């Protein structure tokens, strides 16, 4: 390992990757540290759904995101367990025990709320849908001019689009996906627009999708290599990043301390530029650890003497989730231009339907797929072909239904999987709220307690906000309630419910972007530099200081993309 | 992707390379196939737990072994939900859905039973405990000659536990570990012997441990390289490998059919001989899939022309599993040794003993840790330091308690974590019955039912048979009620129980072997061949034909050993 | 109409539940494959604990119940007592 | 008469029940019938229901009639956990 870089990340998830991407590129000499292993196969941080088994098998997946998804702060737990033997060991209180945070208020919480430390980051697991925020929930990159910011938005998410692959045409042959679709988009025929949810994904086969993830973004291959015989980076994995180093002036950063958790060996690593890609709570962790913000429980009689907007102003999506089975209307109409007659198992019974007619609901591929089905398989009672792929349905965010909203099948399911009703009459339902950015809800960390890597622990003191925050998650059920049911009625033991605070992984405004450090209350400027400091840049959803719904990491990355327009005009790449 | 191969192996498990790892080291060019993928870092096929972050949270392991193992046989839901709204669609019947097998028995299921597809198969999760058989518990590798037998078998097994890595000693200084091994070999002095469950793993440091997988044994890296320039091996992921053409004098096999999941493509590849190694079920179904015993519903009025002992004699095991909250008593004792100044918390609360002492109970590197946990966590109540591993405590099947068994604490837990009971005092009890092998007992294949690789669907006809297997579970149950109550009582919400047939994973004799295809009922010869056909081999579980209790993977790589020996002398390497 | 009944009006539900029987409760066919194997063990879903054959599962009243006491389901009822308006009423 | 185990973190002040019940077409097809050969714990002809909720305007009705629980109890609280809206037996 070298001692000196042009650039260091720290974090290789999607939006290291979107630094690594450019500025690899640019020609800089660039070092990636993360805490976590390759573990995605040889393609290196690629997503783990990538498999032919799990596609298959899909409802195993779960499996795969709860392994990986480690809590943030756990408060101690009180539950009462008197049924044990009187031979066995029991304390007389409710003491700190199995990891979990003395510190944490557990009615103040997100409890919900975890980490994943493996290369690739999140993006090893997550659902890849990547839809642009509209004004309302984005944050201005140029004040007073409403078009020129459009344009910049506009410029850098296209730009973004690219790196992810961002398409909407993945599922358009899905039966199911039309089903629901076209039944949302009929019955509110000019109230509210339907589409596909904007996916990072490329589709290989009728039964296979290829989903974006971080090694899409940068292949986090070492260079040079055959492939990049000019480009400068190596991955160091298995390597937790703990602390930046401030000069006195706290006008630069002069090294990043390191930890190799292999060899166990702590090294300084010098580059011009650091950049902090490890998340929205662990790049708050690390600068905390650093001097930056306040160490310890909040204390106003205390400011910090950097970044007082540090870990302020956290915002988190209120998230509401049911399932639906399809009514028998929808079924039916999936064989509304069908002629069937005889009876199915029989030698005399057939199905068919007049190809072109313009009286037919259907498409001719929809009518050839269900024919087919019925045809092969006249045991089934149902119209849908058994490896029809699943919805992906969304209306977007708008002003009249402040919401984003999924409406299909996510392969993260919250509870045991049902096996009693046919899987192809399940649609999923999640609708996303946005979070006003209050002072008052914290991420803070320790000053005695620590966690698995002997960092400060953090904690949360979070509520939604009363006022608009708390009447649109409200109106968002009700919403849900409302739109679900013209497709179908609940299915039991998924019935529409609040998720606990922090499930949606959605985090937000840890240490956010504006245009002044005291008027806008926050900790990055638009170009993602951290106040006073000519060399120090944070990269992730921690930035975004707006109340958004829609999921943030293309927006996180369209700013990371800006964030490298400013690298590449003030500092210059080492000669190779 | 060569046409023609020396060998090909079905299969990259623990017991595929045990035979790439014999005849690529043996100069044949060998081809291995799965139909899974590289999922798993960069030692192609590595035990998935040996990463940082499972082995600071290993707890979240029991996800990673959820999320591959794919049920066997689920037999079609007959669970009533009548609480739809009555617009969802509803059945009339309980048709076959979510990928439900209608030719299963509910009742006389393994419904445990399960798959993995992933390089290195199920090494790449499993628990590595690798202890040999007894003469009890094991098939005769020579007749009439109780001494030679023995003598093959330590050879054999002498070599297996070289390739895993086995030892005995890699817990040796874990407090927990000693604390139960002291305590249960005092309570049945001379009666049984205790000792550390023989474990296919290396220590790194006193908090982690390089568990061994298939990759142990074969590091699965394509060849020639730079470490081995002239060997040959290719390993092709992602290849459904179906079936083995005979010829039609069914005494040789003329090509393996593969289907390449990835390009959809369908090949023939040639070799000279054919080494099945696809598990206990999946070996069965590529026989039963290629002409070998009986595709279908068994029908004694039209026996099998080939193998017709395949799939029947099967035979798993019972288990038996409870955990238990450390006693007061052993506890306390943890601490006898330990001179206790003061009062916890304060500059004056000293800890400190004697080391060497005549008087002390425990050794000084006991003392030592104990000492420096008390001191270091004065608010703790328990002087178990926070690091110390679990124990790994066996007393090996005997005749007078035919069981095998685990104590301690194993990553594959069957219930939710608790997290109100500290996780130090609890002590997990896994005891294992061995099954008489009876020929009603089967595993078949369906003649119309297909899994999600388009195979025919596998099915069980099971019971544990009445008479001694049934006596010895009963018997089993109560002895790890009474051995248990000797650490301490059960852990509400792990009562002691019979876990569902087929979780063990310890499937064995569904293409046994024998000395006589007739006379013994079985499959394959004791080189592994199968009979009649000069160059095709099975590898693994599915060839032990006894009753056994202990873990099965150690003999199994045993028995290839010895069929490598075959191949060798058998046939003649190509010129490179 | 107890004092410690409206004292401890969680505590009705048992008395409701109590006296409500259920009317028709098809054969169950609930998989047990945890039983010791020394235990008996049905090898079909045969008529057990008071189930109807002829009941499909899966066209049933199953919430439905009777009560045999005096003053039969009155002793339990809720007093909910509105009329019929006359689309609702012979 | 509730239906679950009784809750008892929230506060039972703040807690307020909705039941909305629908009215069901008579249809010919559905039945209440009694065995001839199975008897109940009386020794009288055992009953046996043959019931689905019509099809058309019950089953709408049915379906409107939770979309209007949702949206009328939404005025007075947010779904307790553990009583999220849910149709009962039958
Ligand atoms: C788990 C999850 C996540 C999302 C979805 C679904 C699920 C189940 N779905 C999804 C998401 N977001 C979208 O916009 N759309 C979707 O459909 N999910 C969230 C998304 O996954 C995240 O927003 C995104 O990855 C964040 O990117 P990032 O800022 O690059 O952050 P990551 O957490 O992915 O990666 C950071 C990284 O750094 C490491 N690390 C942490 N601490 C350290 C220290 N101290 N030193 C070194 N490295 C560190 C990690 O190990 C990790 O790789
Ligand atoms: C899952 C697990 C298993 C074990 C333990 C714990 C748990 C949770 N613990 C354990 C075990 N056994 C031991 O002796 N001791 C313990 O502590 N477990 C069982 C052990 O894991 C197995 O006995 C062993 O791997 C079997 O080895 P194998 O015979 O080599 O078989 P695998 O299942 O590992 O590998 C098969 C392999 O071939 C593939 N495959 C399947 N079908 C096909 C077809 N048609 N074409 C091509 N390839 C195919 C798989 O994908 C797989 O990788
Ligand atoms: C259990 C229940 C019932 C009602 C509500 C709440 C709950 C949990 N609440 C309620 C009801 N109705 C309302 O209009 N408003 C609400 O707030 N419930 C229904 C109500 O309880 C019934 O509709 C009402 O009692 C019916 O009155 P009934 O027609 O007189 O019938 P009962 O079932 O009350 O009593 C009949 C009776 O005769 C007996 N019996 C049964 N078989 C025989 C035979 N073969 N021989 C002799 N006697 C027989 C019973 O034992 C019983 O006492
Ligand atoms: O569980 C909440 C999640 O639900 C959906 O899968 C979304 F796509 C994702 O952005 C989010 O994290
Ligand atoms: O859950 C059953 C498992 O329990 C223990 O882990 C044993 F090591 C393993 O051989 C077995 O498969």
Redesign the interface.
Known sequence: MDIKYDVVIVGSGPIGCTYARELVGAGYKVAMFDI???????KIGAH?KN???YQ??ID?????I???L?SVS?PV?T???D?????????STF????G?NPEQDPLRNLSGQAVT??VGGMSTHWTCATPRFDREQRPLLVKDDADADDAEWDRLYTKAESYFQTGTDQFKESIRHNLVLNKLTEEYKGQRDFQQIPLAATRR?PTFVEWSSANTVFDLQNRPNTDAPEERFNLFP?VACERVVRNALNSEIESLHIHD??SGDRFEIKADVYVLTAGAVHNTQLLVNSGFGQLGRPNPANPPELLPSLGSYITEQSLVFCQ????????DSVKSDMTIRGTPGELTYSVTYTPGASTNKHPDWWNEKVKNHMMQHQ????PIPFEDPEPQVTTLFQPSHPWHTQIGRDAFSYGAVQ?????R?IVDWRFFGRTEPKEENKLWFSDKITD??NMPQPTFDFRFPAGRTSKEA??M??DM??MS?KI?????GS????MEPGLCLHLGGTHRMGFDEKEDNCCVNTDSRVFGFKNLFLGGCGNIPTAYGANPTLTAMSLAIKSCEYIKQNFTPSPF
């Open positions: 976590g292993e390759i573990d995605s196969g040889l783990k498999t032919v088994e298959k098998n195993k997946f779960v499996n795969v709860q392994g990986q480690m756990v737990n539950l009462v367990v049924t044990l033997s009187p031979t066995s060991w029991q304390a003491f700190v025990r199995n979990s430390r493996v086969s298995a958790l292999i639906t089975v399809m009514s028998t209307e929808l079924i045991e089934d009672p149902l096996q009693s009703i046919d899987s009459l698995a890597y409200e109106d059920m009700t309630c409302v049911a179908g009625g609940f299915l039991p019935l529409p419910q609040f």
